[PDB]
Design a protein around this ligand. Sequence first.
Ligand code: UDP
Length: 433
Amino acid sequence: DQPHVVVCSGAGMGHLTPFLNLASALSSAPYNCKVTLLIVIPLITDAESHHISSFFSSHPTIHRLDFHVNLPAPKPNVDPFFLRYKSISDSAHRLPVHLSALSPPISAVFSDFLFTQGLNTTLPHLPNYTFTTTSARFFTLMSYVPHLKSSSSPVEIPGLEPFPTDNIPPPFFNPEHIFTSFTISNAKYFSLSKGILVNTFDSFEPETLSALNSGDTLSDLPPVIPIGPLNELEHNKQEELLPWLDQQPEKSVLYVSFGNRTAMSSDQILELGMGLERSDCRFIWVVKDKDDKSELRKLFGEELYLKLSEKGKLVKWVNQTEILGHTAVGGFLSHCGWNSVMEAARRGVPILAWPQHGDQRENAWVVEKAGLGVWEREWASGIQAAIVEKVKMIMGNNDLRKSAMKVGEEAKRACDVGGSSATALMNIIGSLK
Ligand SMILES: O=c1ccn([C@@H]2O[C@H](COP(=O)(O)OP(=O)(O)O)[C@@H](O)[C@H]2O)c(=O)[nH]1
């Protein structure tokens, strides 16, 4: 009686992570499905491949299905990942033969946005749940892209707060930019998906979600269903910073990380370093071979590098979830990629938001609206002052600490028994039996 479901992931670490979390959750109680996880190969980065094989090693019950799509040749002035995304969207029409061979016959697919057109035209009788990896707020923008036909005036979707022009990726106004092309092709088929799953929870984006599900946006979207707080994955490889964290005072450490996609120049990193050193706060900072200091000594110079190392840790990689969950961490300076927002929210960690792109600026606004954090809109205009001023607020202001804590309590409730997200996901799986 146990449903066989397919999780159809795309490319790029930020998009794979929630799909791996979802596959893990569905293969486990209380869902207890048989899960086939589809991987698009070949993988673009070594990090992606590393994380996937580690996932299957630690989740032996989940079946791996490789979907080979030829890598496109690189082009001058075209983002490699966009070319890869486009490659993947263009091959989704091939999925039917591969998904139909699976045994036992599958009950549903949970798919990346890039597969939407392929799945919903070629497999119209199979429930397809489109799983977006962004905020409900930014997803709404993406679904409206076919209707953008003013390149420089805010976009007003009915029932939602307008999207200011400087938070919209400028490609969105050119129908033939490569990113816009596969965005339009797949958003045009959202109407045929059984639902849109979002890694968010009702109390985190209540006005966006109620507007979407009341009909106010006047879209033909299916129901938009928050399923998050998604449970994060156990990494066997242990975090070498947890004993050091155990010796810092509660809520005294600022965690600094700008994601997989960071667009920060050496000069920006240097000013951030100068700013953190002047703040004298303790910190863990992911900058950019894990044991190499030499680049950091070159970047900061010896005196600043040593002053920074007296108070914090400059590292290449951490188990983010383990760091954010530690009692000693009092704040999170983040680019506001949606995975990092959700992880932080799950832990009630106040966020200082320095977004770099369009979806991150919208996510930063969601973070501020929920009381999870504060968005420094012009952080790039004065990096040292922005960090000196706001770190003392992120780590000392009791109102933001208490509102971020309530966000964490609501995030825990949502993914607990009877929570709004757990119920939603259980009703989907129950509908398959
Ligand atoms: O040292 C690190 C830095 C980041 N992350 C993870 O990388 C992801 C970043 O995704 P996000 O959406 O936040 O940003 P993106 O990389 O896509 O820009 C998160 O899940 C983090 O937990 C991590 O595990 N260790």
